[PDB]
DNA sequence: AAAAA
DNA sequence: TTTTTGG
DNA sequence: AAAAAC
Ligand SMILES: Nc1ccn([C@H]2CC[C@@H](COP(=O)(O)OP(=O)(O)OP(=O)(O)O)O2)c(=O)n1
Ligand SMILES: [Mg+2]
Ligand SMILES: [Mg+2]
């Protein structure tokens with residue numbers, strides 16, 4: 144059957160047969176992100192995504208026939224990798240000073256594209272020179288990013304994610320005993336590692352005020368136990384939690400990035416779908432809804448622009464059915 | 479950079 | 484060709 | 491007042 148250009152019409156499991164090609168495409172996309180070339184960035188991310196869905200490895204140029212998101216530029220990169228097992232284009236990016244600095248600087252929690260570009264133009268090349276500088280002033284987010292750097296750069300494994308789930312559930316049921324807590328993000332998609340642990344929290348009987356106060360109550364509780372290392376509440380919150388080694392089957396603990404999302408009970412299917420990801424799967428779900436169905440999808444609702452009506456859903460399956468899409472399992476959304 | 483309009 | 488590319 | 495966080 145014909146491979147769709149949309150990640151939401153493809154099954155993408157964690158068995159990637161084309162990592163030689165996708166690692167190169169991911170590097171080229173990242174360089175275009177840094178150079179603020181959004182269009183070229185997105186084209187390399189889509190090409191990498193479609194190759195991740197293939198049930199076989201590309202071994203010749205003939206194998207690329209009929210695969211969407213592979214134009215002339217991308218096919219030239221694939222040809223070069225088939226030639227000698229390496230990408231000369233990705234090798235040039237890996238040796239570029241601007242690219243090396245951007246990767247290193249943005250690896251700090253609280254440092255994005257703008258601050259990384261600023262530090263590079265100031266002549267900084269190492270994290271040690273940035274941290275020891277007497278004129279630089281750091282945001283509260285960056286201070287936490289540097290303080291817990293080694294823990295946050297080492298990423299989270301499944302026993303750690305599960306130990307965090309227990310902490311989240313224990314804290315949440317203390318204030319809302321009927322609340323449903325679901326682990327979302329990469330770990331829901333079957334990943335054995337991740338940069339953080341994400342959760343969706345919802346309650347069938349909580350009031351508008353109870354729903355608003357839960358994240359404040361849960362973070363104050365952790366602050367009292369000395370487990371809240373960083374907190375930013377937007378409803379959602381970006382946290383750094385202290386995970387004691389005794390809770391997971393040196394200092395005796397590990398800093399873990401945790402994100403919590405609280406949503407009204409009736410919108411829980413839209414929120415679950417939006418927070419499960421992957422990022423490419425989400426973008427293509429919304430792109431497909433707009434361009435193929437004249438619908439508008441977000442983390443709270445699904446709207447029909449022609450009929451001028453909102454479509455209701457109690458599950459992810461009902462959202463896929465409204466969109467006219469075959470149901471894709473969470474472990475098949477690794478686009 | 480690739481595909482739709 | 485020009486426009487869109489998640490929201 | 492950008493900038494960072496998904
Ligand atoms: N630009 C983005 C980033 C994130 N998300 C959504 C989908 C996944 C969910 C969690 O985001 P992350 O934690 O940033 O990513 P991840 O899939 O969970 O991967 P990792 O396991 O490495 O954290 O939020 C999104 O729609 N668009
Ligand atoms: Mg995540
Ligand atoms: Mg996250």
Ligand code: NA
Nearest residue numbers: 249251253254
């Ligand atoms: Na960063």
